[PDB]
Amino acid sequence: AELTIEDALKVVLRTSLVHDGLARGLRESAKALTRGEGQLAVLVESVTEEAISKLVQGLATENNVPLIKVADAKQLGEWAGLGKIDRDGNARKVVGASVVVVKNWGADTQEREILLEHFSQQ
RNA sequence: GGGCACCACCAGGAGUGGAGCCUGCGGCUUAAUUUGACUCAACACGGGGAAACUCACCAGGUCCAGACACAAUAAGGAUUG
Ligand SMILES: [Mg+2]
Ligand SMILES: [Mg+2]
Ligand SMILES: [Mg+2]
Ligand SMILES: [Mg+2]
Description:
Largest sheet: 3 strands, antiparallel
Family: Belongs to the eukaryotic ribosomal protein eS12 family.
Helix content: 40-55%
Order of helices and strands: HEHEHHEH
CATH class: Alpha Beta
CATH architecture: 2-Layer Sandwich
Pfam family, one: Ribosomal_L7Ae
Number of strands: 3
Strand order of the largest sheet: 1-3-2
Bound molecules: magnesium ion
Structural class: mainly alpha
GO cellular component, one term: ribonucleoprotein complex
Keywords: Ribonucleoprotein, Ribosomal protein
Distance between the termini: 27 Å
Radius of gyration: 14 Å
PDB class: ribosome
Number of domains: 1
């Protein structure tokens, strides 16, 4: 299986982390959405009380929609790298990443862009 | 017994010790009147003539500048403002 299984969002996130352009957490994400900063939106599916998700949706709506599904949040966090050192390989203490919004991007083109386009044009 | 030296004395000078005042050091005083050093070899010495700084003392307040290791919160905020 050569085709990516929604692995042109995770990569983007990683890139952002590397270059320091991630609005992780909710307030930060909201802020990003509000001004010329928040370009891609990343909201958790499994949200208790549905409230955070709703908020995120609202934010997305407000001017320009940059949203996507997200696979449980924890996975995303893991991919990003939430934990120092963590032995030789893997073995990171699990953390729920919560709401994330992308600033900067950094890396250009590749499959992420395509995915974004697909999400957009309907 | 024999040497040597105006930090010994002679022969002399200038003196200090008195006077007032500076400044050191005691003693007392004081929250605290920071401390070191008392024969020459402590006492205008600490290059020490302190207005704060210096600064060590006292009365009061501020600050972490608690490197690093390992867990409790680990974003429904750690703590920073
Ligand atoms: Mg002598
Ligand atoms: Mg004096
Ligand atoms: Mg003298
Ligand atoms: Mg003076």
